[PDB]
Amino acid sequence: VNSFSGYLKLTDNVYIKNADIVEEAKKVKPTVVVNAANVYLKHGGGVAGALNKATNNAMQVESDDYIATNGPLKVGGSCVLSGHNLAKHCLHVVGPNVNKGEDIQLLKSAYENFNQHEVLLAPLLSAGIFGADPIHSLRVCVDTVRTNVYLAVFDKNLYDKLVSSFL
Numbered sequence: 001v002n003s004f005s006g007y008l009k010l011t012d013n014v015y016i017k018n019a020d021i022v023e024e025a026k027k028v029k030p031t032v033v034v035n036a037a038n039v040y041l042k043h044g045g046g047v048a049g050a051l052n053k054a055t056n057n058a059m060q061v062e063s064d065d066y067i068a069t070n071g072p073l074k075v076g077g078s079c080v081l082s083g084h085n086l087a088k089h090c091l092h093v094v095g096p097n098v099n100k101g102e103d104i105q106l107l108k109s110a111y112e113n114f115n116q117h118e119v120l121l122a123p124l125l126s127a128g129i130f131g132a133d134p135i136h137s138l139r140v141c142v143d144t145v146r147t148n149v150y151l152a153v154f155d156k157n158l159y160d161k162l163v164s165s166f167l
């Protein structure tokens with residue numbers, strides 16, 4: 001039993017809700033919140049900009065030190081950093097950005113990072129400003145993640161479309 005409330009169950013391990021991931025994280029304080037990161041951990045917009053804003057820029061400060069030490073992530077890769085006031089940990093995961101020409105096949109590799117964590121609150125990878133089809137992202141999520149994932153979808157119209165079209 002966990003504290004996630006109001007989710008629709010899609011499969012044995014995948015759950016979905018129309019929710020602002022920032023507000024959901026503040027309420028649940030999950031062990032892991034996933035950020036829709038880029039390789040430079042520059043949290044300017046989309047989910048990343050919103051999560052970082054909610055940390056009063058502490059996420060960005062921590063991220064800049066991470067990059068100065070380690071260099072950029074790989075597309076499809078991840079790193080674990082602090083969750084600040086939102087979660088115990090933040091798993092920064094880099095899905096391919098279609099608006100940069102990145103290979104959509106890397107979306108499966110990106111979701112594989114979730115399997116290192118028993119339970120996660122997450123957005124749909126590569127959706128939103130990353131330019132991928134969110135229906136496809138949900139399909140890859142369900143077919144790749146084996147741990148327990150609670151997906152927050154900000155847009156109500158998109159949420160209804162994802163549910164109604166789910167096979």
Ligand SMILES: Fc1ccccc1[C@H]1CCN(c2ncnc3[nH]ccc23)C1
Nearest residue numbers: 020021036046047050127128129152154
């Ligand atoms: F822009 C993006 C970049 C990368 C991945 C996804 C997006 C879109 C699609 C879903 N998404 C969100 N989902 C849940 N909570 C949210 N809070 C603020 C934004 C947001 C924004």
